[PDB]
Design a binder for this molecule. Structure first.
Ligand code: GDW
Ligand code: CL
Length: 328
């Protein structure tokens, strides 16, 4: 099977209530305290608004949750509440309901997000390190809290590039990691889906997020965003395999006794593992360092279990400038 190398027992060592989100009973505050100001976005299961808490004028984000089973709501809420105070995890300010419809909404702290599409083409090397480190803090935090985000992607990484403030948002796909639990591979967003998802390996873990983060890192340092630009989940793996190599994919599959969806036979082709330096060009050269590549190489590994953990990634020399700057 497969087990997270870290935080594999977080949840089992905690009270069941910590992870038994289905048993979680949110205290649903009154959404009437919030004035929706503007739609910020809409997901499959929610719409998100900038809002003002009219009681204290606090600008917040209200994520109005769509008619999904309350299980997923409880999951997100419980996860968010478990992650409360987690570094760079979006702060769930409150769980509120329209007091009449009882439609639940999550109130999050407001972040002035810098559009990642533009941001990622202008990040400096240090910025990337900085933000990746910030994101890793969130991931290490949530992983340490027994939670996989499972949808790490730029759209879920709010970066206020003015305040250098990063929040990992949208915990709606997040799940508690329980060793040996088989999870839905229909998580994350295509370009950020780890190979494990793409090969329907359900016994994944926090390291899925590290793949996604690796994808983000790759996109940031290489400025190819998304870095692995699959046209669909199949092609996503092909795109990955075109970089990480098909023999390496097969070794991964073999290690986890994964058999490919046979549809991959006629599309994976045969691809040598590419040197990450292959992605360096004049316009990203300044973002790419051996340390970045080494880190990336250790994140974008098929073998989810061999990917760096968030903490390991944070410990990677690539972030030394950030840590050094953090201290000094
Ligand atoms: C405003 C910038 N969009 C960029 C994609 C993020 C919108 N967006 C979402 C969420 C949250 C946000 C958001 C923006 C600012 C602060 C806090 C939050 C959230 O919690 C979700 O949960 C569900 C998906 C959408
Ligand atoms: Cl799942």
């Amino acid at each position: 099977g497969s087990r997270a190398r870290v935080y594999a027992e977080v949840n089992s060592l905690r009270s069941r209530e910590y992870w038994d989100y289905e048993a979680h009973v949110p205290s649903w505050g009154n959404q009437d305290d919030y004035q929706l100001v503007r739609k910020l976005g809409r997901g499959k299961y929610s719409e998100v608004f900038e809002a003002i808490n009219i009681t204290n004028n606090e600008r917040v984000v209200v994520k109005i949750l769509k008619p999904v089973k309350k299980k997923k709501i409880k999951r997100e809420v419980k996860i968010l509440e478990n992650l409360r105070g987690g570094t760079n995890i979006i702060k769930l300010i409150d769980t509120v309901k329209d007091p009449v419809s009882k439609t639940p909404a999550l109130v999050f702290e407001y972040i002035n997000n810098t559009d990642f599409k533009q941001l990622y083409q202008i990040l400096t090397d240090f910025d990337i390190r900085f933000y990746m480190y910030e994101l890793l803090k969130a991931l290490d935090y949530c992983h340490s809290k027994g939670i996989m985000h499972r949808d790490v992607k730029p759209h879920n990484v709010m970066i206020d590039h003015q305040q250098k403030k990063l929040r990992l948002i949208d915990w709606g796909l997040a799940e508690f990691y329980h060793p040996a639990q088989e999870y839905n591979v229909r998580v994350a967003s295509r370009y950020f889906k780890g190979p494990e998802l793409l090969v329907d390996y359900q016994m994944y873990d926090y390291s899925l997020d590290m793949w996604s983060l690796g994808c983000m890192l790759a996109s940031m340092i290489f400025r190819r965003e998304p870095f692995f630009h699959g046209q669909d989940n199949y092609d996503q793996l092909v795109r990955i395999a075109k970089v990480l190599g098909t023999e390496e994919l097969y070794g991964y599959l073999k290690k986890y006794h994964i058999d490919l969806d046979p549809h991959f036979n006629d599309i994976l082709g045969q691809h040598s593992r590419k040197r990450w330096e292959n992605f360096i060009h004049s316009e990203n050269r300044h973002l790419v360092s051996p340390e970045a590549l080494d880190l990336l190489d250790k994140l974008l590994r098929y073998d989810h279990q061999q990917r760096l953990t968030a903490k390991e990634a944070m410990e990677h020399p690539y972030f030394y400038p950030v840590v050094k700057e953090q201290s000094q």
